[PDB]
Design an enzyme around this catalytic site. Structure first.
Site, short mmCIF file in Angstrom:
data_model
loop_
_atom_site.label_atom_id
_atom_site.label_comp_id
_atom_site.label_asym_id
_atom_site.label_seq_id
_atom_site.Cartn_x
_atom_site.Cartn_y
_atom_site.Cartn_z
N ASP A 101 0.85 -1.18 0.00
CA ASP A 101 0.00 0.00 0.00
C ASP A 101 0.89 1.24 0.00
OD1 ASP A 101 -2.43 -1.41 -0.06
OD2 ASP A 101 -2.40 -1.67 2.12
C1 LIG Z 1 6.82 12.51 17.48
C2 LIG Z 1 5.30 12.56 17.39
C3 LIG Z 1 4.84 11.83 16.13
C4 LIG Z 1 3.97 12.77 15.29
C5 LIG Z 1 2.63 12.10 14.98
C6 LIG Z 1 1.78 13.04 14.14
C7 LIG Z 1 1.13 12.26 13.00
C8 LIG Z 1 -0.37 12.51 12.94
C9 LIG Z 1 -1.11 11.18 12.76
C10 LIG Z 1 -2.53 11.46 12.28
C11 LIG Z 1 -2.47 11.79 10.79
C12 LIG Z 1 -3.56 11.05 10.02
O1 LIG Z 1 -4.27 10.28 10.58
S1 LIG Z 1 -3.75 11.34 8.24
C13 LIG Z 1 -4.97 10.19 7.54
C14 LIG Z 1 -6.03 10.99 6.79
N1 LIG Z 1 -7.09 10.12 6.32
C15 LIG Z 1 -7.33 9.93 4.90
O2 LIG Z 1 -6.65 10.49 4.10
C16 LIG Z 1 -8.47 9.02 4.44
C17 LIG Z 1 -8.35 8.69 2.95
N2 LIG Z 1 -7.38 7.62 2.75
C18 LIG Z 1 -6.56 7.61 1.55
O3 LIG Z 1 -6.69 8.47 0.74
C19 LIG Z 1 -5.54 6.49 1.33
O4 LIG Z 1 -6.02 5.32 1.92
C20 LIG Z 1 -4.17 6.83 1.92
C21 LIG Z 1 -4.28 7.01 3.44
C22 LIG Z 1 -3.63 8.11 1.30
C23 LIG Z 1 -3.20 5.69 1.63
O5 LIG Z 1 -3.35 5.27 0.30
P1 LIG Z 1 -3.22 3.67 -0.03
O6 LIG Z 1 -4.59 3.03 -0.03
O7 LIG Z 1 -2.58 3.49 -1.38
O8 LIG Z 1 -2.36 3.01 1.02
#
Ligand SMILES: CCCCCCCCCCCC(=O)SCCNC(=O)CCNC(=O)[C@H](O)C(C)(C)COP(=O)(O)O
Ligand SMILES: CCCCCCCCCCCCCCCCCC(=O)OC[C@H](COP(=O)([O-])OCC(O)COP(=O)([O-])OC[C@@H](COC(=O)CCCCCCCCCCCCCCCCC)OC(=O)CCCCCCCCCCCCCCCCC)OC(=O)CCCCCCCCCCCCCCCCC
Ligand SMILES: CCCCCCCCCCCCCCCCCC(=O)OC[C@H](COP(=O)([O-])OCC(O)COP(=O)([O-])OC[C@@H](COC(=O)CCCCCCCCCCCCCCCCC)OC(=O)CCCCCCCCCCCCCCCCC)OC(=O)CCCCCCCCCCCCCCCCC
Ligand SMILES: CCCCCCCCCCCCCCCCCC(=O)O[C@@H](COC(=O)CCCCCCCCCCCCCCC)COP(=O)(O)OCC[N+](C)(C)C
Ligand SMILES: CCCCCCCCCCCCCCCCCC(=O)O[C@@H](COC(=O)CCCCCCCCCCCCCCC)COP(=O)(O)OCC[N+](C)(C)C
Ligand SMILES: CCCCCCCCCCCCCCCCCC(=O)O[C@@H](COC(=O)CCCCCCCCCCCCCCC)COP(=O)(O)OCC[N+](C)(C)C
Ligand SMILES: CCCCCCCCCCCCCCCCCCCC(=O)O[C@H](COC(=O)CCCCCCCCCCCCCC)COP(=O)(O)OCCN
Ligand SMILES: CCCCCCCCCCCCCCCCCCCC(=O)O[C@H](COC(=O)CCCCCCCCCCCCCC)COP(=O)(O)OCCN
Ligand SMILES: CCCCCCCCCCCCCCCCCCCC(=O)O[C@H](COC(=O)CCCCCCCCCCCCCC)COP(=O)(O)OCCN
Ligand SMILES: CCCCCCCCCCCCCCCCCCCC(=O)O[C@H](COC(=O)CCCCCCCCCCCCCC)COP(=O)(O)OCCN
Lengths: 58, 438, 127, 120, 536, 83, 15, 77
Positions: F39
């Site tokens: 993925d």
């Molecule tokens: C040191 C501290 C660490 C810092 C942590 C900070 C990080 C923040 C974590 C929270 C961020 C999120 O959740 S950001 C997640 C946002 N949610 C979405 O985008 C839903 C739609 N999903 C898609 O478009 C695809 O599934 C995709 C995911 C692109 C993959 O593609 P593949 O299907 O090809 O794998």
């Protein structure tokens, strides 16, 4: 009344206008660059941060 | 004294009779003979004669010449530094102009008559207009600046000399005269204000130095700026002490302001020659203030610092000239990697820059210590002000060195045998003065 | 390998330069830097001056609390449960001369007032 | 988030957020042992919201995660020494050839070396 | 005999840096260590003659170095007990660093110039320590300043190294300017520059402030500590010399030689620098940075002790001499670890088979820093902490600094050895010659001798304190060490970030002081000389 | 040191085996990540594992362009600092 | 080609 | 003649692209801010001046008060 003041070349406007387009030096890219202006923030104790950093057993 | 003056008159004379192909060799030999005659003058100067070591007159008050502590040091400095200028210059026209300028300057230092002093120093006015305004490498603006500033200041000095000659009846230094007039003091002072660059009358110097040939720049910084201290010690402090004491808060304001503004202006410079020129302007302020205190510590300190500058500034201007010959650039931004590409030029450059920053093993340290002591004798705040602001010189020098020291460069630009020969006397003299043989 | 490592060369200038380009230090290697780091551009740790000031505001009181008590709230008599070291008269008189000495705080001594005035000496030379 | 990150498409933005978060996990850790649980936690955090289709909620999540990744940027990034931002980057850079060396410099027109005053 | 040491170092400098083409890399690997060994023999003779047998000597090289009217100074060397002790420590550390550089700098193009700079650096330090007048001290002060500028910026093609050198130079200029002002005050009102006649029972506050401001530069105290952390750009041998002895110690030496300091200021500034340095070292992730912050903390302890009692000067010098050995050992071991692993980050270090000598030397130096009982560092630190009890403010801060020191030191020891391997699976190796083993033997010998011979005469004199108050430094150190091994979190992310940014002193300077400096320069030039007063 | 293609291939293949989903026989010197079953989040982890294996730092723009086994091997071979 | 001073105004208007 | 304006892209894959540029506008501090910081920093720099002024004022005021009291005591008596 005509006076010297009328014909003196007073420096009120720039003779030369700098070129608008200007060179910005290449710099390494920082993906996330927003400045933190608040010493105490909810972000530090965010639920995400607690799960990702504080909670996992080490 | 008579031997020195005769050799001085022979050096311009020799050119008229040379083959036009032997000009450079003859000029070098004459310069060395003038240096040796200056050494003889030093030998024939007994310390037992406390006031004037030697005075000679050739039939008139104008032809009265004599050597004192200030005069002796400046004359020896001019004779020491002239050979370097001679070797750096090529062409009969250039040699003629340089030899005439040198003769006029060297005769001015030993002159004891204000009118004769004026006649000799300002004779070299058109020659500098022509030299700084040369066909390809010169700027007419710089020539006009230096010429007009010199004419206006020297004319004011001349008016004061005429009044002193009318009122007292003589203008010779050897005759004790005192004046309380403020117009006459200002007339004599304005020359010193312009010649030794002091804000806001310092604009002529940087332009002249940048557009002058290396021989011209070396002569200018080395001795032309010093001619102010001879006028102060010989033609101002004896007669116009009362006005220097009356105006001391103003003198101090103008000198400290010159030191500060010049230091800040040096920070915005991108040309090596302009950096060296503004460093000289900053350095002149301490000498002027120290002499104006009218104390033993101040007069000695000012003369000593003048010698140290007259040994350190020609070195930097010589190295800058050598670098420009090798690269045809004076922009610090284009010059990089000089440490790796020119280890021998770089070593001497770093040594001279350390000298300019008044480090202990350099003459500048001893001179600065004495000048600061004289200021502290006047007031503690006076010394503190000067000591604190000295960091600005460090910031600009450090930034320049850092930009030059490293980077990527594809050109090997190092000094030749001729270039090392030209700086070796200056290096040895700097070292000797640094160890305490001031 | 300490020597001979690859480096990226900074691209040659290709646009009109800003007037204050002297604030940028470029030796020809790709990552050029400001004259003083943090003057402009990316800030280390993404922390602004305001954040640092707020931190110092939080910290300063806690750090200053020990010092303010003894220096201001406390007094010579109550600072310590003992008097300063006792010396013979010849030694004590000489030691009392030193402004930066430790015998000037002896309240028991009959010369306490003079010694205290000596300790709080002149700010600058009178002559 | 910087402009370059913002111009990127959604997929590349989330890949970048994952990459940066993993690097920041490495920077804030005291050893490799800490990294593995934290990296698994970050993976689970992204996997949890991957199937969301509501554009508005996705935007909120992305923006919040970007603010978190901006605040938690480390003062000292853990960078390999030989790479830009590394201690040994540029220590002794490899010299390129084609260097212009002037042989016997003082012996080229030795007598006439100096500056001339040209006049009209 | 006394002059010989300075002669040997200056000769080694001139030979390596002017005649290196003839001597060669191997020639510098001989002449350097040989000269330093001879200087060690001379320094040992000096130490025995002056310190142990109470025989101070004055050698006047020449008179009238500066002779303008009343002002007269001579180049003279007085070897007093402080001078002998510092000479010995400096030469011992320099001899070790010279032995170390033989293998460390083999991969560097100018090994001859490096050795020359190291020997000139040691010579100027011995000139500063042994000077009999204030001018000789200034000559040494400037010489070490210049040698540091030439050594921190050794890598010219790195913009960080050149900026670090400029930073050092500017900070040291501000400090030596305050010193010059204080020397002028002292000459004017005492009549001489010699320390014998310099003695003044009551000094105006201005001179005290100027002296302190001058000292806080070299001995990086608060507001003037920015250059020390940056000085990590230079090669590891430079860092060992500057941090352990040559640079940080000069400020303390000046304060102890002329007791013009004010009790109120030195105590607060010291305790603050100790705490801040420890907090900064907690956040740091570079091995070499943590040891620099540790140096800052220890300097804070030495500055703070001067306020506590009359013997504070003796206690400070005793800590200074004890600190130079272990701190030098810590830097040399850190350098070897970096060289062997090709890594500067604590995260990527771990347990790996190595030399027994290096691991032991690191453990013992860390233990000395930590305060492990019956060690040279312990006696020199307890002498300070126990005697600081009278000043309630200084004591509390210094105990907190002891805790933070223990925590980071234990964390570093765990990360470098106990922790599992953290670097990549790539071929890396640095083989250690017998010269490095001799260098560590010398450092360990210094550490052992310090325990037997002691640091101050009043080291073991009784401080009349309850048992609970006398033994508290140990409990605080143990608690910090245990907390550091567990790698626990002590502060919130906001404070950890604050401490990583070192308090934002440099961000303040860049945003406000540098901008004001360049605006003053813009007004002075663009607006005025080249604007209002320039013709069309 | 210019590392040869054969060594780079074997080590990239070695690294790719570690994903649980991937079948040990599908990974070939010229295979897209999609066919392998990775993925987007998996691709980031794989690029990071490559970063650990060869001890290099991949700029993010190039790392985005790595999506097949072939281009990764090419990139590592091109890099002169790969170990 | 060399850097030159900018002339304010249009050519025909100045003429 | 002039140096080439064409960059080298040999190391672009290894060390990153040069596309990202600086965000600084290359302009200095505002005039209002500069006035405050000059008139704040410069007094800090001139700390000896204020100490001398303070002590001198205190001395002169004491001397004047002494003279006033002397006059008063010398008038009646
Ligand atoms: C040191 C501290 C660490 C810092 C942590 C900070 C990080 C923040 C974590 C929270 C961020 C999120 O959740 S950001 C997640 C946002 N949610 C979405 O985008 C839903 C739609 N999903 C898609 O478009 C695809 O599934 C995709 C995911 C692109 C993959 O593609 P593949 O299907 O090809 O794998
Ligand atoms: C007894 C036994 C014998 C033993 C010998 C003893 C005898 C004693 C003295 C005898 C020596 C001969 C005298 C020389 C006469 C001709 C000299 C000459 O023409 O100069 C250039 C000439 C070079 O000729 P050239 O290269 O073949 O080409 C010239 C062409 O003709 C035209 O070329 P151009 O068109 O391209 O012009 C370019 C011009 C660039 O343009 C300019 O710069 C013009 C500037 C105007 C004048 C310069 C103002 C500043 C001059 C200051 C004076 C210099 C001395 C400084 C000392 C201070 C004195 C107060 O540059 C120059 O010309 C040279 C620049 C510097 C020279 C200027 C000095 C000359 C001043 C006046 C000359 C005398 C002419 C009198 C005429 C007599 C009958 C006609 O001679 C030289 O070698 C240099 C000058 C030597 C100066 C000594 C002359 C004395 C003047 C000093 C005044 C003191 C009072 C006089 C008393 C002297 C002792 C009693
Ligand atoms: C200090 C506070 C801050 C400093 C300045 C702040 C505001 C300044 C306000 C003044 C101002 O705006 O001036 C601009 C104005 C020039 O107009 P512009 O807008 O720049 O452009 C017009 C030109 O076409 C421009 O065309 P251009 O670019 O071709 O010409 C440029 C030219 C234009 O420059 C000038 O025309 C005047 C240059 C010097 C002005 C003298 C003092 C002016 C301000 C001093 C007090 C300001 C306090 C307010 O600059 C120069 O090249 C000449 C300067 C070279 C000589 C350097 C000598 C410096 C002397 C004093 C320096 C000024 C003090 C600052 C440094 C402090 C150091 C002590 O300058 C003046 O008009 C002079 C004002 C006062 C002159 C003194 C009194 C004259 C006495 C006449 C008496 C009447 C006699 C009756 C009989 C008549 C029959 C014969
Ligand atoms: C491209 C260069 C390659 C060659 C390098 C050359 C190497 C040079 C060697 C450095 C010289 C170091 C010697 C420094 C002392 C200077 C020697 C000196 O000045 O001679 C003195 C005699 O004094 C001496 O000989 C000093 C002894 C020199 C050696 C003793 C120990 C050597 C260790 C060096 C430490 C010196 C510290 C001095 C700091 C000021 C003259 O005696 P006086 O008659 O009193 O002269 C009057 C004084 N005054 C100069 C001020 C006018
Ligand atoms: C005080 C009594 C005795 C005095 C002896 C002093 C010690 C030796 C002094 C020798 C001459 C003093 C100044 C030498 C010229 C200054 C230039 C210099 O020192 O180094 C040159 C080159 O060095 C030389 O060739 C000559 C040095 C020989 C000996 C230098 C010893 C250290 C200098 C002492 C500092 C002078 C003190 C001045 C203030 C007290 C430049 O080096 P870098 O800028 O670092 O670049 C080199 C390339 N790389 C990037 C790879 C580092
Ligand atoms: C409040 C002042 C209290 C004490 C004052 C002492 C120091 C004040 C400011 C220190 C400036 C010195 C630092 C420096 O020279 O280094 C700069 C060089 O900067 C410059 O040259 C700019 C000029 C700054 C010097 C003076 C600016 C401040 C002046 C103070 C007040 C302004 C005017 C007041 C009176 C004139 C290099 O920057 P970095 O990036 O941090 O280098 C470190 C290495 N590394 C890359 C690894 C991070
Ligand atoms: C074997 C060969 C050695 C090779 C290299 C060594 C070179 C010489 C070494 C020692 C010689 C020292 C003489 C140099 C200058 C010293 C002048 C000096 O101090 O005496 C002053 C003479 O008055 C005067 O007026 C003297 C004026 C002339 C002095 C030189 C003027 C500068 C010329 C160029 C600088 C080069 C100098 C070398 C009066 O001294 P004082 O009354 O102040 O009391 C002295 C305490 N300060
Ligand atoms: C009772 C009287 C009441 C007061 C009345 C005063 C009335 C006017 C007084 C002014 C007198 C000063 C004389 C200097 C005038 C300025 C210079 C002229 C400007 C100029 O354009 O000169 C150009 C170059 O000059 C330059 O490059 C020189 C730059 C500026 C020179 C600076 C002046 C020297 C210092 C000023 C004072 C110093 C101390 C004062 C005591 C050459 O022009 P061109 O050859 O192309 O001709 C083509 C025609 N445009
Ligand atoms: C505004 C700040 C002043 C700028 C100068 C700063 C530093 C310069 C000091 C130079 C040192 C010696 C010069 C002596 C006096 C010159 C300036 C002193 C200040 C001044 O102007 O005092 C005036 C008296 O001076 C005079 O009457 C003469 C003034 C100068 C004349 C100007 C041009 C003269 C040129 C003449 C050429 C040669 C003539 C020879 C016959 C008026 O002060 P005050 O006593 O009336 O107090 C009444 C106030 N309530
Ligand atoms: C233990 C001994 C003490 C050691 C250090 C103690 C330092 C304590 C001083 C800081 C505490 C008071 C701060 C003043 C209150 C400000 C509260 C918020 C700050 C604020 O809003 O503006 C800031 C002003 O910078 C500022 O706040 C600069 C004011 C600082 C005063 C000068 C003191 C020296 C500071 C040196 C270290 C401090 C580092 C952090 C301040 C950032 O302004 P901006 O850049 O965002 O404006 C935009 C550019 N147009």
């Amino acid at each position: 009344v005509k006076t010297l003041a009328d014909y003196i070349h007073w420096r009120n406007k720039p003779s030369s206008i700098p070129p608008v387009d200007e060179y910005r030096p290449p710099v390494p890219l920082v993906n996330y660059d927003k400045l933190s202006t608040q010493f105490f923030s909810k972000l530090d104790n965010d639920p995400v941060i607690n799960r990702v950093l504080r909670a996992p057993k080490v | 004294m008579s031997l020195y003056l005769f050799m001085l008159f022979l050096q311009p004379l020799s050119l008229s009779f040379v083959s036009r192909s032997f000009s450079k060799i003859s000029s070098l030999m004459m310069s060395f003979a003038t240096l040796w005659s200056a050494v003889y003058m030093w030998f024939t100067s007994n310390g037992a004669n406390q006031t004037f070591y030697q005075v000679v007159s050739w039939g008139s008050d104008w032809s009265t010449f004599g050597v004192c502590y200030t005069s002796l040091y400046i004359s020896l400095l001019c004779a020491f530094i002239f050979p370097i200028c001679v070797i750096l210059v090529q062409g009969y026209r250039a040699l003629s102009i340089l030899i005439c300028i040198q003769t006029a300057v060297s005769l001015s230092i030993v002159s004891l008559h204000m009118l004769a002093f004026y006649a000799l120093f300002e004779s070299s006015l058109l020659l500098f207009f022509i030299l700084i305004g040369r066909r390809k490498y010169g700027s007419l603006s710089a020539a006009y600046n230096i010429s007009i500033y010199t004419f206006i200041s020297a004319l004011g000095f001349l008016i004061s000399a005429f009044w002193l000659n009318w009122s007292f009846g003589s203008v010779c230094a050897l005759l004790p005269n005192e004046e309380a007039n403020s117009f006459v003091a200002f007339g004599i002072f304005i020359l010193l204000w312009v010649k030794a660059p002091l804000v806001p009358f310092h604009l002529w110097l940087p332009e002249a130095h940048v557009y002058a040939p290396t021989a011209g720049s070396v002569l200018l910084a080395g001795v032309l700026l010093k001619i102010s201290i001879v006028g102060l010690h010989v033609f101002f402090l004896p007669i116009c002490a009362s006005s220097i004491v009356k105006a001391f808060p103003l003198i101090l304001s103008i000198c400290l302001g010159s030191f500060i503004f010049s230091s800040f202006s040096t920070l915005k410079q991108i040309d090596l020659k302009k950096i060296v020129a503004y460093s000289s302007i900053s350095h002149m302020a301490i000498v002027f203030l120290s002499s104006a205190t009218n104390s033993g510590l101040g007069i000695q300190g000012a003369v000593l610092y003048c010698i140290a500058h007259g040994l350190i500034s020609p070195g930097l201007f010589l190295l800058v000239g050598i670098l420009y010959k090798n690269t045809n650039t004076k922009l610090v931004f284009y010059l990089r990697g000089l440490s790796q590409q020119a280890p021998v030029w770089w070593s001497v450059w770093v040594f001279f820059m350390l000298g300019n920053l008044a480090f202990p093993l350099f003459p500048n340290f001893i001179a600065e210590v004495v000048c600061l002591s004289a200021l502290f004798k006047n007031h503690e705040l006076y010394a503190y002000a000067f000591i604190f602001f000295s960091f600005v010189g460090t910031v600009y020098s450090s930034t320049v060195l850092g930009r030059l020291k490293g980077g990527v460069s594809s050109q090997c630009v190092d000094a030749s045998r001729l270039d090392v020969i030209s700086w070796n006397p200056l290096v040895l003299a700097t070292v000797v003065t640094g160890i305490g043989y001031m | 390998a300490g020597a001979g490592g690859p480096v990226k060369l900074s691209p040659p200038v290709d646009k009109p330069l800003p007037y204050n380009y002297d604030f940028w230090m470029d030796n020809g290697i790709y990552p050029g830097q400001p004259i003083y780091d943090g003057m402009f551009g990316s800030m280390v740790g993404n922390m602004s001056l305001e954040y640092m000031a707020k931190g110092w505001l939080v910290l300063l009181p806690i750090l200053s609390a020990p010092f303010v008590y003894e220096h201001c709230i406390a007094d010579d008599v109550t600072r310590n449960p003992f008097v300063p070291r006792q010396y013979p008269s010849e030694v004590r008189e000489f030691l009392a001369l030193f402004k930066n000495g430790f015998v000037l705080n002896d309240y028991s001594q009959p010369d306490y007032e003079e010694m205290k005035r000596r300790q709080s000496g002149l700010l600058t030379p009178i002559y | 988030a910087s402009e370059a990150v913002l111009r990127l498409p959604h997929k590349l933005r989330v890949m970048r957020m994952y990459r940066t978060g993993l690097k920041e996990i490495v920077n804030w850790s005291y050893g490799r042992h800490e990294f593995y649980p934290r990296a698994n936690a970050l993976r689970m955090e992204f996997e949890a919201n991957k199937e969301l289709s509501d554009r508005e909620q996705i935007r909120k999540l992305v923006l919040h995660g970007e603010d978190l990744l901006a605040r938690f940027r480390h003062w000292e990034p853990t960078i390999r020494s030989e790479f830009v931002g590394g201690t040994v980057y540029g220590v002794w850079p490899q010299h390129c050839k084609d260097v212009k060396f002037v042989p016997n410099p003082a012996y080229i027109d030795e007598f006439k070396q100096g500056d001339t005053v040209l006049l009209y | 005999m006394f002059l010989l040491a300075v002669y040997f170092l200056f000769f080694s400098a001139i030979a390596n840096g002017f005649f290196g083409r003839y001597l060669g890399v191997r020639g510098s690997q001989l002449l350097g260590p040989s000269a330093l060994f001879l200087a060690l023999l001379c320094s040992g003779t000096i130490f025995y003659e002056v310190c142990i047998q109470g025989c101070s000597t004055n050698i006047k090289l020449f008179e009238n170095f500066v002779y303008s009217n009343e002002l007269n100074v001579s180049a003279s060397f007085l070897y007093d007990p402080l001078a002998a002790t510092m000479t010995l420590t400096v030469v011992w550390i320099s001899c070790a660093v010279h032995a170390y550089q033989n293998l460390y700098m083999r991969g560097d193009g100018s090994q001859t110039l490096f050795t020359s700079y190291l020997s000139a650096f040691t010579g100027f330090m011995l000139i500063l320590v042994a000077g009999q007048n204030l001018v000789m001290l200034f000559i040494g002060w400037e010489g070490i300043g210049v040698c540091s500028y030439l050594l921190i910026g050794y890598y010219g093609s790195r913009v960080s190294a050149v900026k670090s050198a400029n930073k050092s130079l500017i900070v040291n200029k501000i400090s030596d300017g305050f010193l010059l002002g204080s020397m002028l005050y002292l000459w004017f009102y005492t009549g001489s520059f010699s320390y014998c006649s310099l003695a003044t029972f009551q000094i105006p506050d201005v001179v005290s402030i100027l002296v302190l401001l001058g000292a806080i530069g070299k001995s990086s105290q608060l507001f003037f500590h920015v250059w020390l952390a940056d000085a990590m750009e230079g090669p590891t041998p430079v860092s060992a010399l500057i941090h352990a002895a040559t640079l940080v110690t000069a400020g303390i030496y000046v304060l102890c030689k002329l007791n013009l300091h004010s009790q109120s200021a030195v105590g607060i500034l010291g305790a603050a620098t100790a705490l801040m340095g420890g907090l900064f070292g907690l956040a740091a992730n570079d091995l070499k940075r943590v040891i620099a912050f540790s140096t800052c903390s220890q300097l804070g302890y030495m500055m703070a002790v001067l306020s506590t009692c009359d013997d504070g000067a003796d206690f400070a010098m005793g800590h200074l001499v004890s600190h130079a050995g272990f701190k030098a050992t810590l830097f040399l071991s850190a350098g070897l670890s970096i060289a062997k692993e090709n890594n500067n980050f604590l995260n990527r270090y771990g347990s790996r088979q190595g030399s027994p000598t290096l691991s032991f030397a690191t453990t013992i130096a860390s233990l000395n820093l930590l305060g492990f009982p019956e060690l040279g560092g312990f006696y020199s630190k307890e002498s300070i902490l126990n005697n600081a009890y009278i000043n309630q403010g200084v004591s509390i801060i210094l105990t907190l600094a002891t805790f933070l020191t223990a925590f980071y030191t234990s964390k570093v020891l765990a990360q470098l050895y106990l922790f599992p391997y953290g670097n990549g699976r790539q071929q890396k190796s640095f083989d250690i010659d017998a010269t490095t083993l001799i260098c560590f033997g010398l450092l360990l010998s210094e550490m052992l001798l310090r325990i037997f011979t002691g640091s101050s005469l009043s080291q073991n004199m009784t401080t009349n304190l309850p048992a609970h108050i006398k033994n508290l430094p140990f409990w605080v150190a143990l608690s910090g060490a245990l907390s550091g091994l567990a790698t626990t979190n002590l502060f919130s992310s906001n404070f950890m970030r604050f401490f990583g940014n070192r308090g934002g002193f440099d961000v303040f300077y860049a945003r406000k002081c540098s901008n004001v400096f360049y605006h003053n320069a813009y007004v002075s030039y663009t607006l005025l000389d080249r604007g209002f007063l320039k013709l069309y | 040191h210019g590392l040869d293609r054969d060594t780079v291939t074997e080590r990239v293949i070695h690294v790719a085996k570690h994903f649980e989903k991937v079948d040990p026989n599908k990974i070939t010197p010229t295979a897209t990540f999609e066919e392998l079953g990775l993925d987007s989040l998996d691709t980031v982890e794989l690029v990071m594992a490559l970063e650990e294996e060869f001890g290099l730092e991949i700029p993010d723009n190039e790392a985005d362009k790595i999506t097949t086994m072939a281009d990764a091997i090419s990139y590592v071979v091109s890099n002169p600092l790969a170990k | 080609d060399e850097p030159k001073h900018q002339i304010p105004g249009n050519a025909l208007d100045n003429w | 003649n002039y140096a080439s304006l064409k960059a080298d892209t040999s190391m672009d894959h290894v060390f990153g692209d040069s596309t990202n540029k600086l965000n600084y506008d290359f302009q200095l501090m505002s005039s209002k801010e500069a006035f405050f910081w000059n008139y704040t920093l410069y007094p800090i720099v001139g700390f000896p001046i204020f100490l001398y002024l303070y002590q001198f004022n205190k001395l002169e005021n004491f001397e004047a008060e002494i003279a006033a009291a002397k006059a008063a005591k010398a008038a009646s008596e």
